Each structure stands twice: as structure tokens, then as C-alpha cells.
């Protein structure tokens, strides 16, 4: 069982149809290079608007139901025969989420995952827009494989990766948007960010895919202009956490790595980390302060 | 710029003859429509006297099935003729069950369904518990031609849970037909101020406009223990999304209240304020108890 | 001076003995239906499986083939003509064949002769003398009410009458009167069992708890059936009766006479009494989930 | 005649509106029942005072007390322990802002086994219980006592076959119903006593379990918001067998101690053999979870 | 190459003493274990004579609760000692309901839960409908240390629906404890060949091995109408995944039957045959009727 | 005493010439009738070689519409002449759809309607998938002058659900025209015993007789890869209501199997055994899933 996977890395304008045209052109090229499962970066429908905390930007959200972009990638997914996770800003009555729709090989929409861990701070004011996720971590059974799909900031938490691997995830996927921070140009998070994810891969014995955007984006915030240089470094790690394919910080990229899933599962089962786990001693992970279980 | 909706609260006195009262409601619905109304709200159990001052066997038989109801059917023609949304309050018989109900008529005459009053009041003058099974529809919202609306009934207006339930389901405007006034056992009770404040609270906490239509007039009912009298205090009103009263009637006059809301700006104002983004349903389990400890089955 | 308003309806319970010849028993039924109609009856109730002996004392292959389809049933068709002639409602109890399934059924014939449909016995009894589980699939129509020319009625069959759930299911759906055709008597394996008083009190309890009148028609006579282990006898104990909405018995037959019982009810006054008493206003379905278990803990799928 | 035997008792008495007096009365009669061999003794509903629900008064709501350290429950626990008898104690419960018509089941060793909160709440002239009590939220319960597994419910609950069946399905071997019922102050023509008995006898026969009903006697006048209101409570406390037969019954005005012995092993055997529980059709009972015959409640 | 499992069907005659019969089971389980068995199947209602020839009040009281059942508890010790999976058939009392049930004990002694007999037979010699409520667990599969298995009971074995339900839920092997023999009212009835053919059919249609353990011996029961005799015919067998019988007992002696199955090669063979991807559940709705027309509720 | 019906299973080798095969079918139907048959079953797709081996474009044109089918019409004449029921297997063209189908002809020559094969497999020697859409008729029963019958086709015969569906609706006899033999990929599998066991299973579980007609002979079709060959193993048989084989053919010669059944006695036996009285459809919802969890 040989599933091919791809990481995509492009620049965005602040125009839905031009951006979707970009993803649509890079997904078709992935399929040309033999891709089965194609990953598109976070909130690629537009500029990373979370630098500002503006009332009108909340109204960029749209319902999950009959979503114009989901609907347009389902046709593309079905025609190529590729799995495609679709990042979008979701409105649900008065709730709002940073969410992703998993569209299978036949165009079928298999459901939704809602970003659980929400970042905050200058340039990344995501807590102003998103309710923290209520779906829980999910695995999606696709024609090619069982896949763990979470979103951006979720990639920093070992709990997310572990939860997905416990639920049958043969591969983990993370659509991302990260770069410089507008308040301090001395902050360079690229090495640290790769390292944390490399750790999830090696600890669970599952390959990993991270798609991150590039280019410069200037947002008109409530306090004047704010700029981010997204640093790319979209990559694919193997089940031991090794970097097999890696993009640069500036150029557009279409990554590919083929994995023998049945043999990676024999590698995982023989190492026996899952049978060796001690859930009886992990109750402290249900606390925030290291003593009080949350309700 | 944005979807606009003109809403209206009506306030009038009732005899105990259905034909008269429906004729009265029709006259006021037309006057609201002449002033630009798209959704018009008629007071609770308007077809007759507020009979719940008595606990009488024979009054139970005022109920009628939802199916082919002559007052709903008559008002469906009006809605369609005028292009107006009309929630119609009525006493429902459903086999051996009975409910204080309301059917939502859309601007094209279409009966969109019903809501059965959930919280049932009790005590001298307001013996509703004797007549109505507690509602089993749960809180609802209705997609009309002008807006998603949440309609509940009278006593439901005192419960933040009901307004919150409707808002969570996408209600853009809340409506409460009412029958409230003095209490026959104690002349010192005057609940009008308290009544308004609690509702203003719902409107401000959910950032949605709110409409309340209340009865006026004195009604004297023969009860199992003699005459009982209520002076209904009107005070029908419309409140905006921060709870401010934008239209209000006095305690005796017949009234047609009008108010226009921009529903796209309000949606935008509601999301911006962030309350729905910040709710903690994980910490609200206690609300599924009556006694602060034991969850209900 | 005027009569008290409200729809009146006159109901009747019949009580008779059967032979094992279908023509003789339908002739008996028709004679008694006509006698009931002569006394003013609007709805007449014939006892369970009246077409023959209560054959369920035996567990025999050949007795299963006594079933017949609901479609073009000779007995139903014949009683349809009688109902139309007299202008009376007649529920018709019969053993139904439905491809490979079999049921103990009842067809409700309206006062204009129209077949309004069927109910299939839900609770199936078992044991010496009453081996019904051998013949009948448990009913799959669920509890029903039928809108007749005179009233909305609830009809169930024999063993069903021991279950408060059935009576309440019918009342909840608007049944204004309950009917139960019955075949019950002595038990061949133990002559000390005399269930007649127990039988009455359970049904009177249904009428009182739902505030609806109730009609039970039961068989009389001794019947001997040839079983796989020899002859077995039941003495059917009659006691057909009509009960009012507080459970009071208004008419009752003895254990051996042929009877035509007659009682008039004002359905509008009883409706009003039923609602004022308030039991239906006060019910707690939220606490009744345990009723959907057999063992008090596990809900059935 | 082998098998576990249990002796049950129904008490019937008049109440004043003073708590100390009425509890002294209950203790007198529980001792009289025990002297006659009773193992489980049933005291009538809200016996601590007059049946105050004829009125709808603010101040009457404050007669309620917490379940915790309830003085009447504590006093009767001592008596239960002294005599070795099971004693259900009816009381008006305050639980934060909720209020219930409740009953605490005291075992023969004096242990508080838990509470049942009245589910079906009556309403109308003379019986304005819906003004005082939240409808109960414990659900129907059964309690394992030293003598038997029992099902205890309260007053108006006795009209509902669903409550008896719920208790039977969960193993209840005897059903107990403390009661307060009599005339109705708005219409002297209403006499519910035969209807009342008939419905309970229905429960006993349909579930094949014995049933004990203890009812109040005497005239009571309550000062209501609209003037005096009077009820004459009609007694008729009784004990029914597993076929619904009345085995013991009191009149409408006598103070009474009723006594009945039951063989629970033989009744269990009879119950199972009759087959009603073997033959039930819960797959066809969903309509029971509706009020209107059509719509399942949330 | 793959996960191997050795299964066993046991066959013996019952006495009227419980302990004797559990000890007979214990002796035969140890004999299966000695010959390499991992999962061992004991016949239906093995604790005593097949009492269902009679319809008696006192026989119903032979039932016992699932909780702290002495026979289940004793067999748990044996399961843990030998490291063998043991399904334990028993007559369950559950408040007022009664069932013909079976508890699946895992190789470490753990009680995995129970299955209640779904299809209850009836007629002379087999009056089971008098004793048991139809099962309400539905068909189940259990995950044991050696395999996911489907266990159903006696009469259940005549129904293609039970066997399919278990395989669809992942059963790798079907098990059917049985009590079947002659019929007391008609000596011409010999159902043994028909009985095997139907099960062999289940094995072949689902491509899973099947094990059936049947009783031997003549039993005379005192019924309400005199003596009734059944001659139990044994013929316990184990069938492979195409329905071929690979081990079979005679009609009169004790037997310990043993067979090994490569469950991964069988899984692969089942997947390859493809029957399960080729089913048409969209065309099977009539299976939810009894009469070929009306779906049950 | 009771309705007696004589049924027949025919078995022969096909040539790849339509006329010849139809003439062969006719000869054997007449032979069956001469031995007393009332209902006669001809094997699946008898008009030619079993072509589902290969996946060829020109083979699709062997399909013909249900209306005015020349083989059906000719067999209608034969049914009316002799007074025998004849289910006619054929390759149906219906617009953008094609089906493996069978039309039931009554003893008076009346076309009673059709059933379209429901279960469509894959695999070498039997690539049914490329030629036939999944049947949309559902499982049917047909009332003939002699009995209510249920008919299903080739691959359908592995599915207990189809046999049960027919029996629930009144089928008193089940008919299964088929084509099965070796597999061109590996000559070690011999499925004839597995096949018989599953069908005997359906006869015994539903207490209905069952007739299966299978072809004999070797057949070589030129395909995409190269010459594919199959040896059809015959073994046509008639089973009774307990699943006993009452009549059976070998793997190499023509046969006309005959068996008489008393449908009234069998119906009485079926009901007394009780399986239909004892079914639990309230516990069978999982059967409306493919994966054993989610309804379709």
C-alpha cells in the first residue's frame, strides 16, 4: 500500500478567486507528480487577516454548508482522484471557527475539524476571531488512508498528534500560516517550529506534512499598518521524524514523498510505544495548572 | 446598507367574543402594515379573556386543534394579502394534551409550524398550570421572508435560558406575546418595571432586538371562588440590541408600535462584542439541574 | 326541557358459545349483532376467534393452516354487509395468514361497511391451555385507534387487556372507548386457578386511569381440543362486561349465559371529565424511559 | 409455607397544624403497628401538618426544609432503629431554590437509604400542589431494605400506571403510596374514593405485586388568599394483594392500623408464571414517551 | 504465516446436579486445553437437564442473576488458569425478565459481557417461549485475546440474519452452543442433517469457520401432562470457512473436537471473495418485515 | 394430497453460435416436459460463450432490449405450446444501462416481467462489472400457473439475503440460473462444494425447494491480455426444503433433472418449523449497512 503525499507553498493576494486559482494550479501539478493526497496551506482564500482585530473581518466567515470554495475543490478532487483538506473561516450561527473540510477521492465531503488551540499576540490575533474548537481531534478514513488533520497552532501540541495516532491516523497533516512577528524582528521561529513537529512524528512513528505560506502581507489594523514575512519551510517528515522533502522561505513549492504505510505500521507495532503507554499516570494532562482537573 | 426589517408590537383590549377580537387584531395588523411593518406581533391568547384567573373544567374546552384552526386560517389570508409575518397565539388541544401555543405565519400565508410554551406560570390570577401541559417543542427559530425569528410566549420572557436558546439557533429578533397585569390577591404587587428590565437584559446579553406585546383593560372573571379581577398594564415595547427601549406604550392606550432594525449591522455588532465567542458551555452543566446539584433525567 | 348535549354512543358486548363449524358461529354472531342493534347499539363487539373453537389448547401443524389472508376474507366480507345493513361498527377477530407470518388479528368495519384496517395482537400469551406463541408472530402494527362514524375507538385483543401500556397508548392517540374481544377461562393443568376477578380488576384499572369506558366480550362454554398429548378442556367463564370512565362496571354477564350487554355513554361529557381530572396534563414522559426496557435497566434496540 | 414473609402496615390518622403533635401521633401508631408484627410501616403524605396546598401562599412555601439534618427524619430514624422497622418519611423539601414533595426511606437499622421526589404534581381547587413543588427529578426508584426491595411513590403518583410499572420493572416487591385525598372544596358532588381504589388495584394486578396506600382522615380548614377552604379527608387506607384484591381496608373516619403478611417468594413465583413481564412489548411503547400521542418529548 | 487459533467443540450428557455438570465441563475443557485449544465451546444450558420440555412455574425459578453467578465465577477461574476463552451458557433472571443467555469469559478470566438469545423456539419438547423473553442485546461480537468472535445460541443457528450480523461486525469465528434432539410428539422427525446444512450455509456465505456444540443422551422430564422424552443427537462439529465439516462427533459419546484456523489467511480469502463489498443493503429492506410488506416498528 | 409441481434443471454446453444454443435449449425443455416438468430452468446466458471473462467493447453489442427480444418471443411460443413456465436469461440493453436479466414466462406464454441481477462481482473469468449495471428491480416473486416463484442470477446465489427476501414475499420455490467453473488465474480452486453448501443453506433456512442450472464444457475466449479458458463444472441440482439434494448432475454431460414437490405439505412444514414466526427484524438493522455500523 503506497500512498503519495504533497506539501504546497504559495503566496496569497486578498482576492478569493485568484487564490483558489493558485491552489487549483498547484494541486493539478501535484497530481502530475503522482500525488494521492494534496495539502493546501491555512486560510489560503485570502490574506492572513488575523494581524488586525477588526469587526468587519469577522464577517469574512461563511457557513460550512454549500461553501463556494469547498464546492469548487470537490469537483477538482473528484476529477483527479486526490484527497484534499480545505482550510476556511467558518460561521455557525453566532459561533466562528478556524476549520477544515476533508474532501475524499470521489469529491465526497467527509466532515469537518475545528482548530482546538487558538494562538494569540501581535500579528496572530486569532483568539479575537475563533471560538476554540468543539469537534475534538479527528481522523478521516479516505480511500488512500486514515489521516490525522489538525490546523496551524495545533502542530505545537504533542497531545493533538498523540490523540490522532491513538485513533488510527496513518499520516498526520498540518496546514499552516507562520512567519515573522510584527512587534519584534529578532523573533525567528522556523527551526523551533520544525523541531516540535519532528518530535511528534518520531514519538508516534507516523509521517508528517506541513504546508506553510510565503510572501509579504501588509494588513491595515486598527492601530496602523502591520507586516508579516511568512517564512515557508513547508516539509514532509518520515515516521522517525527525518526531513525527506523541504521547501525554502521564499519560493513557490510542490513537495512529494511516497510512504509504504503497511510497513510503517509494522515499524510502529514492533517498536511497541502504544502498548508501552501508561494512561494510568497521565491524569495530570487533564489539568492546566498541574494539579486541578478541568471540569 | 443591509437587510432592514420593520417590526411592530400591538396593544389592545379584549372581550370574550372571538369574532370581535380577531376583528380588532386585523384592524391593528393593517394599521401596522400601513406604517411599514413586515412582522407584526399580537398579544397572548387574544381570542378572548385571560381565562386563567379561574381553574375551571369548562374553560379547558376552549382549546382547539392546531389543524384547520379557524383563527389561524383567517390570519393566514391576512398575512398573504399584506406581505406580513404574523405569529398567532392560541389554546391548543392535541388529543388529551393541551398547550399554550403559537403558530408562525410567513409573509406568503405559509404556516411554518408551532411553538408550545415551555415555562408555565401559577398563582392567583395566573393559574396557567391547571390548563397547560408544559411545552414539548423546545425553543425554536423560524426562517421567515424577512428574518430568522425566535418566538416564545409570556412567562417564557422571564427566562434567560429561553432567549439564549433562540439566539444560539440564529434568532435575529425575539418576540414575546404577553398577558400581564395586577394580581388579584395583593393590590401592592406591580411587576411592570421588573418585567421590562428582565427582558432588556435578554436583548442586551444576546445583542438582538426584542418585541413584547401586552394586553390592556380590566377583566373580571367568575371563578370557583367568585369574581376575580386583573387590570392589564400594557407597556408593550420594542427594545434594541443593547437593551434600550426604542418604542413604548403606556398602561391604558390602544397602541401600534413601529421600529426598524438593520439586521446586517446588528449581526456585525453582535459578533464583534464577542459574547458568543466567549461562552463556556463546558461550565454550564449546572443549568441542567433544578436544585444546583442533580442533573435532570 | 332539553336532553343534555354531547355525542351519545351505544356500545355492546356479546357473549356466546362456539362449535368448531365456521358457518354455525357466524350465524350465531349475526343473530346477536342484530339483537344488539335492536336494543339501540352503535358499536358491537364479538369475542376473540369466534369462528371456531379456541384451538390454541394444542400445538398442531394442521391448526396453523386454519389461518386465512386478510384480503377477501369470507367472514370479514359477510360481516361488512351486516354492518352496512344495520349501520353499526363491527370489529372482526380472525386468524391471519400474511405470506409466512401469522397473526391474531382484527379488522375494524365501520357503520357504512368500510373496512378501516387492522390491528395485530401485540402481547402473545403462553402455557397449558393457551399456547398462542406457537401460532402467532407478535403483532407488528403497534397500538391503533380508528375513526368510526360514531367515535374514535381503540381495539386490542385478549391478552393485550392485561397491559396498562396498551390502554394508555390507545388513549394517548385519542381513543374515546376501548374494546377487548377475549377468550379466557379455566386452565387445564390446574383447576385451582380462577383468574376472573384478577382479569376484571386490571381492565377496570385501565378504564379508571385513562378516563375512558371499556368493553370486554368473553366466550362461554366448555371446549375439548384434541392435543398432541390427549384431550384438553377449558371451561370459558364469560363475565363479559362494560365499564365506565372511573372503572365502575355498568353491565356484566354471568359465567354461562348467552348475553347482549348494552350501555350508553356521553362522549363529550366524558372527554370533559377526562381532561379536568388532569392525569394527561400531569404525565411525565421524561421519566418513562424505563418502560422501554424489559429488565428495568437496558433499553431494547 | 416456605419463603421470605414480610408484614406491612398502613396507618391512618388525623393531623393538627402543629409538627410536634403530629410526629407524636405517628410514633404512637408506628409502635402499635410494630406490636402487631409489622416490618414496614407506611405513614400518610405531609403528615407533619395540615394539607396546606388548599392555599397558594408565599409564606407556606417557607414550611419547606432541607433533606439534610431534617429534624423529623432524624427523630424517626431513631424509632426505626429501636424497633427494627422500615419507615418512609414524607416531607416538604427545600433544595436551594427548588422545592419538592419528597420521601426519605429509613431502613430497619435506622439508615437513610435515599429520597424519592414526587413526579406527578396535582392541581386545582383544594389541591394546588403545582404552586409549591417542582415536578420531581429523581425518577421512579426502588430501595433495598432489610425485608424487601420496595417501590415508594407519592399521592398523585398513585393514579399513573407508568409509575407502578417503572417500580415493578426495577424489582420492586411491594408498592407504597402515602396519600392525602378527600372532598374537593369547589364541588361537594365529587367523591373520588372508589375511582382512587380501582386504579391502584389495577396496578397491583397488572404488576402482580402487593400495594399499600395510607390516607389521612378528618376535616381541615385552611385560610386561603380568597377565604376559608375546607376538605374532609376520606381515609379508606388499604392493603391490596398481587391480584388487586383488597385484603385489609379502613373506613372514612376511624384512626387505623392495618396489617398484612405477604410471602414474597410465592408472589415472585406467581408473578413470573403469569407471564406479563415475559410478554411486554417495549418496541411498541414509544408513544408513551409523548404527551399528545404523536410527538416524543425532548 | 499468520495468527493461528485452535477451537473446540465439547459434547457430553447432563445429569440433574449442577456441580456435577460444571465439573463435567471442567474436565472436558482441560482435555481440549491439553490438545491445544484456545477457545472451547460448552453446550447450551449445560448446568442441568433440558427443562423446556415442560412448561412449569417452578422451573422458571431455576433462573439466576448474571451478577455473581456461581457457575460463571467458577468457569472464570478455569479460563484464567488455562488461558482459554470460555463462553458460558446460563438461564438469566433480570428483575422480572428472564433470558437464555451466555457470558464470554476471556483468556485472562475477564468477563467480557453477555449475549441474550434472540430467536426463541417453541412446540412439543422445546417450549422455550414459555421461559425466555426474546433477547434484547442484539447480535454481538467480542474481542478476545485470540480473535473477535460471534457467539449466538441454539435456535439462533437457523437464521442466516444472525450469522451475517455477526460477520458484518467483525466476527472471525461463529459459535453456537446447542440442545437439539428428537421431538416427543412425532418419532419420524430427524432434524440432524437439516440442522448441519443450515449452519454450513452460514459458514460458506460469510467465509468464516463455525463451531457447534450439542448435547447427547435421553432425558425424561416430568411435564404438566406426564413424562416427555428427548433423545439428544450430538453431532457436534466444526466447519471451515467454505462450510466443509472438518471435525464431527457421533450421536452418543462424549467428544472433544479440535481444529486450527489461520485467521489472517482466512481474512485475506474473505476479502478476496468480495461478497461483503458486493452486498446490496439498498435492496434488503424487506428483511425488516415479518410478512414481506410491512416494516416492523 | 395437495398442489403438486414438477420442476426441472437443465444442463448443457454452449457453443458460440446463438441459433445452435437456442435449438439446444428447446430440445432439453421438450425432454423435460416429456418427463412431466411444469417449470423448467435453463442455465445463465445460454445464447453463447460466457463472455464476462474478457472486458471487450464489441461484446457489449450482444445485448438486446427486453421489448420484442427474439429469444424471449420464441421461448414464449414454446411455453404456451407445452404448458410450462420458462424463466429466460438474457443480456439486456436499456438505454445507457445494461443488465444481466431474466424474464419469467408463464405456462400460457405470458411475459410476467423481469428481474435484474443485483450482486455484481469482479475477478478473472467472471468480469461481470464491465458489462452489467447493478440491478434496480430488487428481489421479486412471480405468480405462475403452478406456484409463486423467486428467481435470482449467478452471483446472487451467494447471498442469503436474496433467498430470504424472496421467501418473505411468498416464493414457494427458488430458481438460480448460473455459470461457474474454474478460474483462469489459478487451476487449484474448485468451488463446486462451497457453492452447493451455500445454496443448500438457503433451501434449509427458508424451507423451500431450490433449483440450480449450471453449464458444462470448456470455453476459450480471446481477451485483452490473451486466451482465457474456463472449465464449467456442471453439478446442476435440485434441493428440497431441508436442503437435501434430490437430483444432481455430473461435471461433463447433458442432463434433465426432474423432481416433484407437494407445495401444500411443504408450506405446512415451513410454518410448523417456525423460523418465520421467530424472526427478529427489530435486531436486523445492521444488515442495511455494508461496514456493520452506518446505514446506506
Residue numbers in the entry:
A (entry chain G): 7 to 301
B (entry chain E), E (entry chain B): 5 to 301
C (entry chain C): 1 to 301
D (entry chain D): 4 to 301
F (entry chain A): 5 to 300
Give the original sentences from the paper that presented this experimental model.
The arginine route involves three enzymatic steps: (i) arginine decarboxylation to agmatine by arginine decarboxylase (ADC, EC 4.1.1.19); (ii) deimination of agmatine by agmatine iminohydrolase (AIH, EC 3.5.3.12) and (iii) hydrolysis of N-carbamoylputrescine (NCP) to putrescine by N-carbamoylputrescine amidohydrolase (CPA, EC 3.5.1.53), with the release of carbon dioxide and ammonia. N-carbamoylputrescine amidohydrolase enzymes belong to nitrilases, and more precisely, to C-N hydrolases breaking non-peptide bonds using Cys-Glu-Lys catalytic triad. The octameric MtCPA enzyme is assembled into an incomplete helical twist, made by four tight dimers with swapped C-termini. As in other nitrilases, the substrate hydrolysis is carried out by the catalytic triad, composed in MtCPA of Glu48 (proton acceptor), Lys121 (proton donor) and Cys158 (nucleophile).
The structures of wild-type MtCPA, crystallized in the presence of PUT and CAD in the solution, were determined at 1.97 and 2.19 Å resolution, respectively. In that instance, there would be not enough room to bind entire CAD molecule. This is not the case, and we do indeed observe CAD in the active site. CAD in MtCPA complex reaches deeper than PUT into the catalytic pocket, however, due to presence of sulfhydryl group of Cys158 it bends toward Glu132. All bound amines, CAD, PUT and DHMP, present the same hydrogen bond between terminal amine group and the side chain oxygen of Glu187. Although CAD is able to interact via hydrogen bond with Glu187 at the entrance of the pocket, similarly to PUT and DHMP, deep inside the cleft CAD passes by the Sγ of Cys158 and bends toward the pair of glutamates. Thus, this would not leave enough space for the carbamoyl moiety of such longer substrate. From the MtCPA/CAD complex, we can assume that longer substrates than NCP, such as N-carbamoylcadaverine, would not obtain stable conformation inside the active site. In other words, the proper orientation of N-carbamoylcadaverine, with the preservation of the hydrogen bond with the Glu187 side chain is impossible due to steric clashes either with the catalytic triad or with the residues in the middle section of the pocket.
